[PDB]
Design a protein around this ligand. Structure first.
Ligand SMILES: N#Cc1ccc(C[C@@H]2NC(=O)Cc3cccc(c3)CNC(=O)[C@@H](CC3CCCCC3)NC(=O)[C@H](NC(=N)N)CCCCNC(=O)[C@H](Cc3cccc(C#N)c3)NC2=O)cc1
Lengths: 154, 39
């Protein structure tokens, strides 16, 4: 129920499911973005995953344990978005990140546009490590999107 | 509300992948609600 991998985050009403996000299972901890779940508990098979930590400002939340993802973009190399869009198979998209320049330091950022329910898809370095999650960003003048490479602290 | 997860794949790098998108450098701000904005 906590095997490593990338997962869809789904909601189910009286009929039909909707994909609201994506997340990463690693070291028995599920990692996703706060706006996906609002910190709500997650069903996994027959089991229940409980929120352990979160931060609305970072837009992150972990389940079952502390945040485990600590790989960092090197500021130099191309990365891969492992996009898991609603209703579509997971696909790798390689890209060279731009940068968010903030008063509190620079954050890598990827100029890739996907539906809301792709939020939480992991961004990978060349060794397959997760350097952050996709889905919190800005819209620029031509209507396209730039996502921060959002990484938490371990 | 039933919120649940389902496996979607293994987390691996893909050799000979598609290289797409630009590399913008943007001045941005972040508020206490976690929202980015252009500066
Ligand atoms: N003001 C300005 C500004 C700055 C940042 C944001 C946050 C941003 N929200 C949106 O993008 C909302 C939005 C605005 C305008 C138009 C749309 C949505 C409609 N577009 C889509 O539905 C979809 C289209 C693509 C086209 C290509 C083929 C696939 C589908 N695209 C998107 O929704 C976003 N792209 C664009 N707007 N170009 C990408 C969404 C990726 C996943 N992330 C999100 O959904 C987050 C959710 C969110 C909302 C509020 C707060 C937080 C945190 N805190 C997170 N949305 C955004 O990052 C909006 C306006």
């Amino acid at each position: 129920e906590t095997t490593d991998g990338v997962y869809r985050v789904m909601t189910r009403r009286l009929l039909g499911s909707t994909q609201v996000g994506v997340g990463v299972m690693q070291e028995g901890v599920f990692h996703t973005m706060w706006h996906v779940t609002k910190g709500a508990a997650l069903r996994s098979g027959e089991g229940r995953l409980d929120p352990y930590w979160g931060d609305v400002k970072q837009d992150l939340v972990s389940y079952c344990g502390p945040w485990k993802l600590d790989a960092a973009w090197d500021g130099l190399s191309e990365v891969q978005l492992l996009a898991v869009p609603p209703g579509e198979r997971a696909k790798n998209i390689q890209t060279l990140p731009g940068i968010f320049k903030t008063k509190d330091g620079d954050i890598g950022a990827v100029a890739l546009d996907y539906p809301a329910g792709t939020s939480g898809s992991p961004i990978l370095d060349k060794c397959g490590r997760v350097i952050g999650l996709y889905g919190n960003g800005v819209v620029i003048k031509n209507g396209s999107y730039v996502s921060a490479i959002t990484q938490g602290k371990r | 509300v039933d919120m649940y997860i389902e496996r979607a794949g293994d987390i691996t790098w893909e050799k000979d992948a598609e290289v797409t998108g630009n590399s913008p450098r943007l001045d941005v701000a972040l508020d206490e609600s976690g929202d980015f904005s252009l500066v």
